[PDB]
């Protein structure tokens, strides 16, 4: 990897295009002004991975210069620049960025972290970054649509049940296939399992371990489970013997078993509702059998399936009024499944008094590749430059938008005396009217500053219902 | 990176699942049945990066089993199979892919590759890696999107200006910030470059140098330019001051800037129109300033911006009987374009008689981000085993989606009679009532046998209207 590459094109020409004697340009990122509170999260990896230590060599220069040359077709790269940063700090970046602690729930509209250069020949270095820094907008924006999920399927279960138990386990990762990359796999998983701890997406967890850490040994966890190459490879005929052999090789662990290869209503009435039915209700409340259909409307679907199953096996109705299956037996969606149909589906069980304990969920490319930088409005912008020795509030109001009009200023981030939060602006935090600012130093000179674990940001990332 | 920890966590435990003494795993993938086509690219980045070579040592099989023991919370991880591919084959993988030649426009329904296991005991290795190649639905779908906005681009220039002159330089990649990983930014601006030359994805050079290669010293290539940073940092009353400043620093090459950051309007009117004219009118027809907007109703913008760069420049009607701005001055849209408004800016700039030749495209989380494995419906299917020697037939059909049913047998890709390309299902082509086989052997244990360079991809990939 070599940060000089690591940049959108036309950075390399802004050297060039701020204003003469500018000794210093401060940015900062923000959620523009539901999607009312974010989860700041994945910082602590872009630093690690990307900016910390010697992050310039002679040969990446020389490598940047010869890729810029042909690219530009001119000679536009400050080479002088980048040579300062070798030779001056042994190729360790003079930037200082300030932080809101990861994990923290936050409303949109407020300062998230602040970047700035500590040497004044370095001014073009803040905005350089912005590109590798940006790319938080992913972590940031799964964690907070998963928690979002969090937040219905709480409401929905704890009126079904009266209690949160499952919780936690309810919105599983089936995104591995669906997502752009085999790092975006790692990065977006990390983010889910800010929420909950169930996961297929084996990338996050070595991502986790390297750059956060828990006490556990892993931070999410799995149930064997079949695919349709599982069922459908012992031919279409024998269907029942793949569901046979699959329950009867887990039969003390939980078990999913894609259940629509040819047809879910029949598989669940016939299949597991009689000719199987011996080997579910001798199940452990501890390995249930999970039926999983995979197609159809996601609805409509899980209503007709858990319709069957209530009149195939005993239904036991909870201390709030809603149907339960027997403890051996659940229900997995993982088709079609985003925040959208995830709240469509627990509403149409509730107007059919069927209980959330019933059913969990699994989401791909909803959960980790249906989004976009634009959900949240992240964005990175400078608000503070000193030019001949004195500094100046910068900031960009377009007529046509006033939702893009960004911050002026140096900023802090402050709890408000009802203890919500506010950004100031205009170095105002100076004044010391508001208690403490929440962004702290997290990297400086080329060195990490400040980290945080995995589990005190699960622990900073919780519900209030949880609270 | 490790391969054992590179799949669905689900995918460990079918070993167990499959029919006893299966000898065979053999799957495909298609772009299941406007997005009628779509350019088959990114496998051989995937064959290279991750499966080639020796992939399995007894390290990665230690962390392996111990990350799955506390994951499942059992011992269900596959040590004797991983075990005996690094003894009996040095950790090379005994799968055999074929693959439809990298660049081709294929229609959608049609099989694109396949992988099966060539020994025996490593029947469960065929859908291990199910995961990491249908990742390949990326670089697919950026390909195909980027060359579908291709085809409406060259629709309205041919019809506006009577030629494709420029046609590869206007729709830039701007995405970088707005995907979600560095990873993601590569493979995507590398897909992109397959139908265009320009970009500001710094990432996608690299990646295509490494594993696809061109004549060229660069795939692609962009200019200087602006961002709201370099012109906000001078104060709101000085935005002339740094219009003036960046012309005259960049006088002798194509300059991009953006003019938004207070008023677009009047930056055209007033300090483009009139302040700044006699900088652009002395500039040359190889460095044009190009005015970039960057906020409000794309469509309405760029209407009002020529309206107004048309009363205050030298236009000219051109033979098709279009307006052109003097060749000096240019127009980027960068903000809010993805391919349902860059379809509605050229239309509408076409009824207002403006030529494309006058503008270009600004394409960021649309062009790289805004993309899902459904959008063309991309999916890896298990057709075809082998049990107790027997060769069966295997596919999907959900009764409630008929798109779901997957195709049966040993699959080949042929071309028709008209010269059309069909699939033949059930082994159907040994008949050779069709011809030979399209596909072509791409890898074969642990070697990549068959590669394509990028020049040759983006000859298979070319317009009908430019052929
Ligand atoms: C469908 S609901 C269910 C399922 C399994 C069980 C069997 N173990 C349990 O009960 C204990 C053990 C840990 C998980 N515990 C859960 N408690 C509520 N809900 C849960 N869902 N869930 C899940 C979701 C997705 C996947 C792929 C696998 C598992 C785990 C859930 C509690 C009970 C209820
Ligand atoms: C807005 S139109 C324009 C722009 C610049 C010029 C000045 N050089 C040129 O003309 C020669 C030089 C190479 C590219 N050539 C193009 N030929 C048609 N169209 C193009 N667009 N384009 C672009 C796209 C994205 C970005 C960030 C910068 C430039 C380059 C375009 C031909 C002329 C017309
Ligand atoms: N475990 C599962 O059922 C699963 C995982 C990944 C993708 N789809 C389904
Ligand atoms: N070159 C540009 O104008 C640009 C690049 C990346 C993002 N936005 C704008
Ligand atoms: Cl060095
Ligand atoms: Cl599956
Ligand atoms: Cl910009």
Redesign the interface.
Known sequence: ?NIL???????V??Y????PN?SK?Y?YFECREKYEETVFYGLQYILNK?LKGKVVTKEKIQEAKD?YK?????D?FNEKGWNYILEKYDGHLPIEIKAVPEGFVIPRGNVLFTVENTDPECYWLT?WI???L??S??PITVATNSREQKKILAKYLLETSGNLDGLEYKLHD?G?????????AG??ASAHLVNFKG?????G??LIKKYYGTKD??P???????????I?????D?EK??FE??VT??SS?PV?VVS???????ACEKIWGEDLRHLIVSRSTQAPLIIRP????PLD?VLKVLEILGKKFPVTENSKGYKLLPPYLRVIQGDGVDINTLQEIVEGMKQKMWSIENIAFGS??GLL??????LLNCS???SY?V?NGLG?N????????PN?R?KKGRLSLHRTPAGNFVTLEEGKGDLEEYGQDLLHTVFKNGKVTKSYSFDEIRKNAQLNIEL
């Open positions: 990897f590459l690591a940049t959108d094109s036309y950075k020409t802004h060039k295009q701020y204003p500018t340009v940015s990307y890729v042909e690219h530009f077709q001119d536009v905005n912005e590109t590798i940006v790319q907008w992913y089936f591995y296939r669906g997502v752009s990359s085999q790092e975006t990065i977006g996961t297929d997406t084996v990338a967890l070595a040994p892993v999410g966890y799995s149930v064997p489970a079949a695919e349709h190459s599982t459908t490879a012992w031919g279409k024998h013997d793949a052999h699959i090789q887990f662990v999913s629509d290869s040819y047809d879910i209503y029949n995979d197609s159809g409307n679907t791909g490319g590749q249906k989004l976009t930088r634009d990175f912008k400078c430059v030019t100046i910068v900031f960009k109001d377009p007529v046509a938008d893009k960004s």
